[PDB]
Design a protein around this ligand. Sequence first.
Ligand SMILES: COc1cc(OC2CCN(C)CC2)ccc1Nc1nccc(-c2c[nH]c3cnccc23)n1
Length: 249
Amino acid sequence: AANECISVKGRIYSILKQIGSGGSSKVFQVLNEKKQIYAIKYVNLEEADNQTLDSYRNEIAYLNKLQQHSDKIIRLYDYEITDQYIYMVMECGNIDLNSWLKKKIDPWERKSYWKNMLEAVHTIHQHGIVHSDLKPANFLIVDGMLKLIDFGIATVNYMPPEAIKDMSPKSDVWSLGCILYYMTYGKTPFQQIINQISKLHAIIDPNHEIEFPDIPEKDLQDVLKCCLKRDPKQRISIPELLAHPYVQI
Ligand SMILES: COc1cc(OC2CCN(C)CC2)ccc1Nc1nccc(-c2c[nH]c3cnccc23)n1
């Protein structure tokens, strides 16, 4: 309700509203000189250490490089890096997947979204990136399709057994499967448990079998069961999921 502006590389952008806030960052829905809509991410680097700085520099490098490879990764149009801040001019999505799911899916939409996620995670793996912390908040809805927001470079529900055991590209397969299990049944494989301490024990113990209620899409049931194999060696891969009947037939 005022004339608040952001300057990125000499280009003025008028703030519409704040669509994101977390840690030392803010995300704004903005208008450019030609009245077009974009999103701007602001990172405050004032209290960032050499390790945090490098992790932000690394994400920007991969984001600008990976962009040409896939249209399932958020479009970065411009950026400004100084010792004091980062400004990232991005495409504007309608909403993130986590928020969209909280107010909910169509079988054609679930498959269409799954294909987008597989394409995005496949693209980051081909460049030696294993996200390790994938969840619906990492995906953005833009013109009826999902686009990946971050690479993990910079809820215990989507956490794989390996990650708990360590306290691999297969870890992203577990997290992807957990998102598809949410879009299929309306809940996480372990969501039912309120006690977060007991929840971690169930992911490790193979004596605890994940529930798989029977649905019409027989192929979709097989994907979930393959994504949620506790042994990452026995667990399905990303090149395999792209060749799976659920994705193909
Ligand atoms: C109207 O554009 C939106 C509304 C929106 O919904 C809001 C957030 C969720 N609450 C519940 C309701 C308000 C969520 C996303 C967008 N678009 C959008 N485009 C590009 C980037 C982002 C974004 C949000 N966080 C981030 C964190 N790192 C990078 C990028 C982002 N976001």
